[PDB]
Amino acid sequence: PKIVVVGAVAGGATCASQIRRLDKESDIIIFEKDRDMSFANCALPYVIGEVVEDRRYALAYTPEKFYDRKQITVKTYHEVIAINDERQTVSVLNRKTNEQFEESYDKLILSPGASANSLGFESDITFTLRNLEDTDAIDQFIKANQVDKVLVVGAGYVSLEVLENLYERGLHPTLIHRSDKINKLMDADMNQPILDELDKREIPYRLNEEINAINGNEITFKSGKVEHYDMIIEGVGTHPNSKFIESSNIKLDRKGFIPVNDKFETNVPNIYAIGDIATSHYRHVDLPASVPLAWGAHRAASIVAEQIAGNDTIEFKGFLGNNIVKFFDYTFASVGVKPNELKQFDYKMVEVTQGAHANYYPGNSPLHLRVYYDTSNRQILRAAAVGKEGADKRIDVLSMAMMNQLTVDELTEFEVAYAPPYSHPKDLINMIGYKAK
Amino acid sequence: PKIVVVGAVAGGATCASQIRRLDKESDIIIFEKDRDMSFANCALPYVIGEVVEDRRYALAYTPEKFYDRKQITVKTYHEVIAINDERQTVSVLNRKTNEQFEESYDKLILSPGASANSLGFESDITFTLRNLEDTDAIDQFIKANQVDKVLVVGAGYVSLEVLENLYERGLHPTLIHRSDKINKLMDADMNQPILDELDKREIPYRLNEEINAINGNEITFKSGKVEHYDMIIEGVGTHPNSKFIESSNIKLDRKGFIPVNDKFETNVPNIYAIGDIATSHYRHVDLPASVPLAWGAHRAASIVAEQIAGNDTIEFKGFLGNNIVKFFDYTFASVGVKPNELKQFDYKMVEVTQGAHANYYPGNSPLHLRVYYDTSNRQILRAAAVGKEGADKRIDVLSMAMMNQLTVDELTEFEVAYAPPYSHPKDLINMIGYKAK
Numbered sequence: 001p002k003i004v005v006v007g008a009v010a011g012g013a014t015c016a017s018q019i020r021r022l023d024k025e026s027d028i029i030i031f032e033k034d035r036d037m038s039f040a041n042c043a044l045p046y047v048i049g050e051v052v053e054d055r056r057y058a059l060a061y062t063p064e065k066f067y068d069r070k071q072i073t074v075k076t077y078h079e080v081i082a083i084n085d086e087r088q089t090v091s092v093l094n095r096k097t098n099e100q101f102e103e104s105y106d107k108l109i110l111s112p113g114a115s116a117n118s119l120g121f122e123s124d125i126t127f128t129l130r131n132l133e134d135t136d137a138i139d140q141f142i143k144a145n146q147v148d149k150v151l152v153v154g155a156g157y158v159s160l161e162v163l164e165n166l167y168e169r170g171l172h173p174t175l176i177h178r179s180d181k182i183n184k185l186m187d188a189d190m191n192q193p194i195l196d197e198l199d200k201r202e203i204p205y206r207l208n209e210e211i212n213a214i215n216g217n218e219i220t221f222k223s224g225k226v227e228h229y230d231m232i233i234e235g236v237g238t239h240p241n242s243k244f245i246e247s248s249n250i251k252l253d254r255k256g257f258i259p260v261n262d263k264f265e266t267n268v269p270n271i272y273a274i275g276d277i278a279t280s281h282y283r284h285v286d287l288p289a290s291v292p293l294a295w296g297a298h299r300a301a302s303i304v305a306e307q308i309a310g311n312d313t314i315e316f317k318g319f320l321g322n323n324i325v326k327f328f329d330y331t332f333a334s335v336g337v338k339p340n341e342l343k344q345f346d347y348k349m350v351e352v353t354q355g356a357h358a359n360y361y362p363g364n365s366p367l368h369l370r371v372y373y374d375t376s377n378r379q380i381l382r383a384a385a386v387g388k389e390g391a392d393k394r395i396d397v398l399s400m401a402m403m404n405q406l407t408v409d410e411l412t413e414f415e416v417a418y419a420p421p422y423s424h425p426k427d428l429i430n431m432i433g434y435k436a437k
Numbered sequence: 438p439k440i441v442v443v444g445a446v447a448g449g450a451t452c453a454s455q456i457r458r459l460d461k462e463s464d465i466i467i468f469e470k471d472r473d474m475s476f477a478n479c480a481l482p483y484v485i486g487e488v489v490e491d492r493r494y495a496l497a498y499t500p501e502k503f504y505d506r507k508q509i510t511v512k513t514y515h516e517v518i519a520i521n522d523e524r525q526t527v528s529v530l531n532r533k534t535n536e537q538f539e540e541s542y543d544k545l546i547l548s549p550g551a552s553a554n555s556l557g558f559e560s561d562i563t564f565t566l567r568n569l570e571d572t573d574a575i576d577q578f579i580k581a582n583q584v585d586k587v588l589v590v591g592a593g594y595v596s597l598e599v600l601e602n603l604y605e606r607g608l609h610p611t612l613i614h615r616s617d618k619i620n621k622l623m624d625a626d627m628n629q630p631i632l633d634e635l636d637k638r639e640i641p642y643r644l645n646e647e648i649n650a651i652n653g654n655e656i657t658f659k660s661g662k663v664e665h666y667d668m669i670i671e672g673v674g675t676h677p678n679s680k681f682i683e684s685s686n687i688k689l690d691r692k693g694f695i696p697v698n699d700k701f702e703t704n705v706p707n708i709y710a711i712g713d714i715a716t717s718h719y720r721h722v723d724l725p726a727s728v729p730l731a732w733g734a735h736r737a738a739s740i741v742a743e744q745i746a747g748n749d750t751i752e753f754k755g756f757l758g759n760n761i762v763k764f765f766d767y768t769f770a771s772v773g774v775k776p777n778e779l780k781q782f783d784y785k786m787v788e789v790t791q792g793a794h795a796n797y798y799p800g801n802s803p804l805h806l807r808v809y810y811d812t813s814n815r816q817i818l819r820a821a822a823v824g825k826e827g828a829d830k831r832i833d834v835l836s837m838a839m840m841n842q843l844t845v846d847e848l849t850e851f852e853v854a855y856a857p858p859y860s861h862p863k864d865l866i867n868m869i870g871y872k873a874k
């Protein structure tokens with residue numbers, strides 16, 4: 001088949017590569033509206049912090065190299081502006097020449113992802129972070145203007161990682177957020193260590209705070225405060241890149257995302273959608289799910305490649321929503337339904353706080369583990385863990401448990417790998433099972 | 438019921454405590470032949486290494502506190518010397534007075550564990566390590582004799598832990614072992630970093646080596662070598678503490694262990710056995726299993742408590758044999774059937790070696806993960822992982838997979854918690870799945 005892909009990053013480049021593993025004859029073309037393909041989205045805050053200094057970690061390929069290795073044609077600075085599904089073409093704008101053309105397809109794969117929201121101010125010192133273009137602009141602005149004070153807006157994992165990296169770079173960030181609901185994939189009462197880490201390092205923050213007005217470097221806030229900043233990075237959520245799809249026959253939900261089946265098919269034959277733009281369902285409960293993260297983009301890319309060029313019995317079984325962020329010394333992880341989705345179930349909660357490992361052995365830190373379960377069938381609905389140590393481990397175990405439909409009571413049977421540096425004879429996971437009695 | 442427990446440590450003290458949680462009325466007495474109850478077996482190498490200097494860490498209870506807190510009677514220096522199972526009494530020797538007496542029971546719980554084997558040389562410089570008495574004696578001997586050169590005999594995990602601790606204390610150990618199968622719960626090829634770490638620190642070792650004779654401090658070896666050592670710590674295996682059981686009606690296997698059912702019942706009514714003394718079967722395959730580790734002692738303890746005083750439908754489901762040890766910078770973990778047991782199956786092996794986390798993220802290291810599966814049904818039989826980082830996480834996840842008899846192919850579906858410090862969008866575990874075809 002002739003394969004056209006929209007978006008040349010987490011879902012798109014991966015999918016195209018996986019197809020090429022299976023099918024060496026098909027023509028494959030990817031359109032990407034911006035400058036770079038295959039950049040490491042997750043690495044970007046660390047590039048800003050000068051933790052990653054080697055370009056080759058920020059950018060896996062150029063189009064020239066992708067072609068040389070994989071015989072996949074990637075056209076950057078080409079923006080798909082309409083999908084002519086009845087004719088099986090897409091309309092493409094070459095941004096360099098400002099001419100548009102039609103490209104035909106046999107199979108079309110949509111992985112356009114999302115764009116960062118902006119607060120809308122007219123300001124030369126304000127930036128968003130979504131791609132490597134962004135990252136380079138930020139790094140350049142910092143050097144050209146000898147930036148010291150940075151205002152970081154928003155309190156999701158992107159802003160938090162940006163904040164940490166700005167600090168390690170030697171700058172002086174302040175964090176504001178419009179409410180007190182920070183890091184909202186995590187249970188609201190388990191986020192205190194974020195504030196403790198800011199406090200310990202004397203990093204100012206203000207919650208229930210917003211930008212009210214901007215005058216050059218003079219920033220006036222909703223609280224009435226007036227301060228001077230060298231730069232602003234806004235991390236105020238994202239929106240799906242789906243405007244270009246609206247005229248087509250592809251079905252979009254009211255929020256601009258694309259519902260798909262377990263084969264990542266849209267309602268239109270021969271058109272797939274994957275990554276942040278796609279919505280699906282949870283694996284462990286009968287509810288809709290959107291999990292705009294890297295695992296989902298890569299897994300869908302693999303499934304779509306099998307659908308097109310491999311074993312088409314391979315289908316998605318739904319999301320669990322496993323997610324994690326590091327902030328200074330702490331790890332915050334969760335899996336399962338979102339806090340706001342718990343109310344659709346009759347549920348109970350169990351929790352334990354305990355050293356990640358042997359108290360005696362060096363370097364312990366309390367790890368808080370919380371598990372919500374369905375009273376009707378004792379199935380695990382959500383888990384969350386926060387601690388300096390051991391959190392990623394317990395959440396991955398619980399992810400695997402939820403995959404196999406484990407009950408909370410069966411957590412007593414989990415056979416942990418025990419020695420003093422790693423856990424306990426009855427692990428936190430085991431204690432959750434015992435306490436659920 | 439009147440409950441008599443034999444052994445006051447991992448299985449015994451725990452089981453007594455768990456019964457008391459459910460049952461406030463029953464009289465519970467524990468007999469322990471040595472000085473201390475509830476010592477932290479696992480902590481003992483770290484006590485020798487002075488990584489633990491506060492003994493409260495190595496002793497978790499005294500009989501006086503167990504009685505005040507739990508109303509359970511513990512009699513130390515009381516050795517059970519016979520089981521008179523037909524009259525439901527045990528004969529007990531008070532070691533301080535050297536007088537014996539009978540203690541009656543409605544239920545008897547045997548958790549006597551195992552003792553260290555000895556090479557049997559007449560020598561005042563040789564020590565074994567199994568309890569806190571042993572630990573004190575070793576520590577005392579090091580000080581009294583200003584021990585520098587120490588010979589560590591045996592290359593099992595405990596012995597490796599002792600070696601590491603002697604080294605960090607400032608002593609100069611040499612390791613020997615009678616064969617080349619060091620750390621035998623791990624695949625032999627995957628144990629090489631143990632020898633690498635020894636080599637890096639110029640800690641001598643000799644495999645396929647044994648003591649031939651001891652003359653004071655002069656040690657003569659099988660190789661013909663003759664060396665001077667200030668001290669010798671022998672870790673040459675253990676043997677079950679079942680001599681006191683032989684005259685009873687309880688069935689022992691040819692090695693002196695006690696076969697039990699999934700309720701931890703022996704063949705004799707009202708008598709249970711748990712901990713290192715007991716043998717069972719694997720959870721995921723139909724084979725006998727003996728897993729003399731802490732998790733199993735604690736789990737059986739809880740199950741016996743439920744049998745006696747709680748929910749008697751709660752039964753054991755078998756072992757997976759999850760185990761782990763730290764040796765200097767590396768972690769060595771495995772789960773499932775032992776290497777020698779693989780030959781009972783038609784199997785295949787899949788492996789990956791990849792960074793524990795994002796390649797661009799500092800302090801990364803290669804993690805080697807290996808999975809063996811049954812060709813007849815794709816089910817996972819064994820897994821092993823070795824590396825400076827991330828091994829415990831993957832093996833714990835795989836333990837949870839095997840608990841559910843997951844197939845190697847379903848590993849593609851594992852939803853990992855991804856951010857750069859922790860894993861990859863396609864984790865090592867997923868890669869095992871993708872590589873299994």
Ligand SMILES: *[C@H](CCNC(=O)CCNC(=O)[C@H](O)C(C)(C)COP(=O)(O)OP(=O)(O)OC[C@H]1O[C@@H](n2cnc3c(N)ncnc32)[C@H](O)[C@@H]1OP(=O)(O)O)CS(=O)(=O)c1ccccc1
Nearest residue numbers: 009010013014017018038039040041042043060294871872
């Ligand atoms: C944060 C956000 C996530 N963002 C992204 O992932 C965007 C950037 N990524 C890409 O564009 C894309 O993933 C690239 C980098 C192009 C990789 O494509 P692919 O996954 O198909 O891998 P590749 O072709 O590079 O493969 C080589 C190694 O992969 C093994 N492989 C792949 N697929 C299979 C299957 N199906 N079966 C068996 N083996 C497979 C190949 O054997 C091969 O190996 P080799 O043995 O010679 O090495 C996070 S992030 O920072 O962007 C991030 C992204 C990616 C990884 C880490 C972190």
Ligand SMILES: *[C@H](CCNC(=O)CCNC(=O)[C@H](O)C(C)(C)COP(=O)(O)OP(=O)(O)OC[C@H]1O[C@@H](n2cnc3c(N)ncnc32)[C@H](O)[C@@H]1OP(=O)(O)O)CS(=O)(=O)c1ccccc1
Nearest residue numbers: 424434435446447450451454475476477478479480497731
């Ligand atoms: C080395 C190898 C194995 N060795 C040992 O375990 C050494 C000896 N151990 C014991 O003697 C026994 O395990 C002691 C240490 C006495 C503890 O008994 P138990 O497990 O019953 O726990 P405890 O009564 O002390 O309870 C404390 C926390 O756990 C909660 N709990 C316990 N059980 C339940 C159940 N069933 N349901 C709900 N909650 C339970 C308690 O409430 C209590 O909670 P809190 O006040 O803290 O909330 C291994 S090691 O190095 O010796 C080692 C041993 C133990 C831990 C780590 C390492």
Ligand SMILES: Cc1cc2nc3c(=O)[nH]c(=O)nc-3n(C[C@H](O)[C@H](O)[C@H](O)COP(=O)(O)OP(=O)(O)OC[C@H]3O[C@@H](n4cnc5c(N)ncnc54)[C@H](O)[C@@H]3O)c2cc1C
Nearest residue numbers: 007009010011032033041080112113275276292293294856
């Ligand atoms: C700063 C940052 C940090 C992150 N950290 C993590 C993390 O730690 N863990 C995690 O799991 N996820 C993380 N993510 C999220 C992860 O990067 C996304 O979930 C993943 O990139 C989604 O892949 P995608 O292909 O759907 O979108 P993207 O990777 O963003 O790719 C979409 C591409 O499509 C292009 N495009 C859009 N419309 C068109 C069109 N009309 N024509 C041509 N091209 C178009 C865009 O320019 C873009 O390049 C992070 C994201 C960011 C921005």
Ligand SMILES: Cc1cc2nc3c(=O)[nH]c(=O)nc-3n(C[C@H](O)[C@H](O)[C@H](O)COP(=O)(O)OP(=O)(O)OC[C@H]3O[C@@H](n4cnc5c(N)ncnc54)[C@H](O)[C@@H]3O)c2cc1C
Nearest residue numbers: 419444446447448469470478517549550712713729730731
């Ligand atoms: C140095 C060391 C390090 C270890 N590290 C680990 C580790 O990292 N991870 C892990 O999982 N496991 C580890 N273990 C093993 C763990 O300690 C054992 O699996 C666990 O203790 C088994 O519990 P048990 O009750 O069967 O035996 P024990 O805990 O050893 O208790 C048996 C008790 O019974 C007493 N006894 C025996 N016979 C009689 C009798 N006739 N009358 C009265 N009392 C009697 C003994 O004196 C002893 O106190 C380690 C063990 C040692 C020795």
Ligand SMILES: [Cl-]
Nearest residue numbers: 077095096097
């Ligand atoms: Cl341009």
Ligand SMILES: [Cl-]
Nearest residue numbers: 094100101102
């Ligand atoms: Cl053209």
Ligand SMILES: [Cl-]
Nearest residue numbers: 167168169170
């Ligand atoms: Cl600094």
Ligand SMILES: [Cl-]
Nearest residue numbers: 438439543544
């Ligand atoms: Cl009874």
Ligand SMILES: [Cl-]
Nearest residue numbers: 514532533534
């Ligand atoms: Cl005595």
Ligand SMILES: [Cl-]
Nearest residue numbers: 531537538539
């Ligand atoms: Cl008496």
Ligand SMILES: [Cl-]
Nearest residue numbers: 801802803825
């Ligand atoms: Cl390394």
Ligand SMILES: [Mg+2]
Nearest residue numbers: 050052053139
């Ligand atoms: Mg730079």
Ligand SMILES: [Mg+2]
Nearest residue numbers: 487489490576
């Ligand atoms: Mg000391």
Ligand SMILES: [Mg+2]
Nearest residue numbers: 520521522684
């Ligand atoms: Mg008799």
